[PDB]
Amino acid sequence: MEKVKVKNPIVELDGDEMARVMWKMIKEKLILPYLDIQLVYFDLGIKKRDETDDQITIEAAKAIKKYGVGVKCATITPDAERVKEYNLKKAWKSPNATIRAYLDGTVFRKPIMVKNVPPLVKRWKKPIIIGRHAYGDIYNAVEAKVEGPAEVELVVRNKENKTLLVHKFEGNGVVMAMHNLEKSIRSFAQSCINYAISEKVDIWFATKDTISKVYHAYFKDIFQEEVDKRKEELEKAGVNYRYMLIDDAAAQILRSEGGMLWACMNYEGDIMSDMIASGFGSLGLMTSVLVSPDGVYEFEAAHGTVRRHYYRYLKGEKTSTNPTASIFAWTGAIRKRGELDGTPEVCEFADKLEKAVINTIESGVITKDLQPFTEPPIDKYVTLEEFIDEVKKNLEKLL
Amino acid sequence: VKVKNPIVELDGDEMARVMWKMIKEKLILPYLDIQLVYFDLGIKKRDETDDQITIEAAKAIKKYGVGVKCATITPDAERVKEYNLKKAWKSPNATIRAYLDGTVFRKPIMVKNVPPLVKRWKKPIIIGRHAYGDIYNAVEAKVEGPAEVELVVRNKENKTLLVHKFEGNGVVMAMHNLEKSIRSFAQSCINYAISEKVDIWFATKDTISKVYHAYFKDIFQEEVDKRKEELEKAGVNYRYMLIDDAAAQILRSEGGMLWACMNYEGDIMSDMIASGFGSLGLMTSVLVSPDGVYEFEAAHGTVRRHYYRYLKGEKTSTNPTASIFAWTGAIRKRGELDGTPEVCEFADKLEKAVINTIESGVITKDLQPFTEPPIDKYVTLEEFIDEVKKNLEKLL
Ligand code: NA
Ligand code: NA
């Protein structure tokens, strides 16, 4: 059997630790034997980024924008500990933050659902996608302890100068000031609109604009503006926009059948991506995809580098690390590249490999992370390589 | 059945007030020799007194230690027109809350044939909300064009922080919170947890907010340190967490803890977690103070839409369960404070009578969508209290 021809390149970003180990196996067992595919390769392993003073990350980001579809392996974000461990020059910045900013993108988290690994919320029959506005607010704020009897003002200073009284302290406390940006919020809404049209799902956005009548209102107003500018496009895709109050939204989410994109401001999105992921089960089944306003797509698994399985691997051991999310990053990228190039055999292949993973799990062949979520409970689990071998087997059955 | 000391009783509004009277005269008073220190916080009585009976009610509670409050109307423009008021008076709940320096705790009532939407949740999750400050007392502004925005602290120490240099347009916000308020919050949480014998989970994003969220983290720990002996005695563990970790863990847990939340978080999570349990009709609510005062209330409102039907001569299926458990909560707390273990035993029996009513298939309408297996029919308000009465008589 001939390999399926992929017309245009996919940009591939290699990563770190156990993620990197899985990545190599997926390519060799599940991807390269079946596809004649051009991969524009950037090694984003910590030592390559260290060697090039992180310039390789920017080059990677440029390539993703250029070709339009990327697929990325998880990477170490160094803290002081990693600097010591890998003898780094510097605590380089998160490759993800660098790439996301370069691409003006928003990250969308969506669970893979499998019949025999049901979510922890009974109602949830369809994936809930979390899209987080990852700019500003608390994450770029400035703060101060206020001990004394004091007055605190926010000063706006140039065309129209103004002073606002934050608080007249009599006793002690703390103060915080934050900002966000029109352009940032517009890009976020635009990326949500793109993702929802692509996925054919409704958009829920929510704030507490009844309290925050300028700041939260701003996001509400911008989001609605962007939806209005895309009224027909949204309606053609069957996408409904639902603006809610944030506490109402959270209550309704938990109550729903799932199936929507929940667009969240920065802090809420940080919390809810984790909380909703938890409601679905294992992080091993969480996919992630960056989408930008200009239609650039970058697929990744939602989890990290899985360093503690990696430390076990370094001692010679097989692990039971779940490759499922990494596989679906590959198949997501492949499908997208296929849809763009107009090459339906490419989409078909991505469908078949995805189907092979799901068939593997539903047939009772799981890695260790899925075990406490199985129904009926599954007693046995296999190593990462056994799992990939079973996926390969089930792929062959469909080809 | 005696009850050594009085309880402060706060009458309310609309359908809530209607259930209130019904419950006293059918389920409480026929069984207990109590001095209720009565305050009518009905909107008409509040308007006449210029909101003073509200303040009067709160000063009585602080004195007598235990209060029980009916849902009241918080007036807006529509309500001013409806009841022909003087002003849109301030929320009684918010008025009392501040005076008593209390924090509110929400706890679902669990019932076997009305299961939560979250499978793992086997024990109630209490949400305690720090209902002062942050975005609720924030100051905000739209920013156009090139501009520099700054945070300026003035007086004992003088400080200017660049918030942002704007090239395009955007928005800014500044907020505050207070040492005292956060301490009172932590104190109330510790009181509640010791009373309920549950663990305390507190969480922030102090890995990002290294001064502001850290302040809450440090103060909460300080207050736990101050009371570690009694906490250890009651079997209460304190578990500080990162906020996003906590939320993931809560959904993953079997319930059973108090989750203390900062203002915004608590606004969201109270509703979210209530939703995970089922019907708002099975939600109890208690204000605890740092000094140990308690005020028991239903979580629900006045149910105006049921009240209007009532005035039109229709029968409703309004749920009194939350109301009754506000009464029993008050009765039990007052029983244990004097040392009268018969008052407590009645509080138990009435709660257990309600639970037996529901579990036998006798429900109000609001429960129907949640019951498992589903109940084909529902009973009215009057009929539900009558069955609760039957089932209480069976236990006495
Ligand atoms: Na998070
Ligand atoms: Na709320």
Automatic annotation (TrEMBL), chain A:
It comes from the Bacteria. Its cofactor is Mn(2+); Mg(2+). SUPFAM superfamilies: Isocitrate/Isopropylmalate dehydrogenase-like (SSF53659). The record marks Y139, K208 as: Critical for catalysis. The keyword Magnesium applies. Belongs to the isocitrate and isopropylmalate dehydrogenases family. NCBIfam families: nadp_idh_euk, PRK08299.1. This is Isocitrate dehydrogenase [NADP].
TrEMBL record, chain B:
It catalyses: D-threo-isocitrate + NADP(+) = 2-oxoglutarate + CO2 + NADPH. Keywords: Magnesium, Manganese, Metal-binding, NADP, Oxidoreductase, Tricarboxylic acid cycle. One of its GO terms (molecular function) is metal ion binding. Its EC number is 1.1.1.42. Binds 1 Mg(2+) or Mn(2+) ion per subunit. Mn(2+) binds at D244, D267. The record marks Y136, K205 as: Critical for catalysis. InterPro entries: Isocitrate_DH_NADP (IPR004790), IsoPropMal-DH-like_dom (IPR024084). D-threo-isocitrate binds at T74, S91, P92, N93, A94, T95, I96, R97, R106, R129. GO terms for biological process: isocitrate metabolic process; tricarboxylic acid cycle. Belongs to the isocitrate and isopropylmalate dehydrogenases family. This is Isocitrate dehydrogenase [NADP].
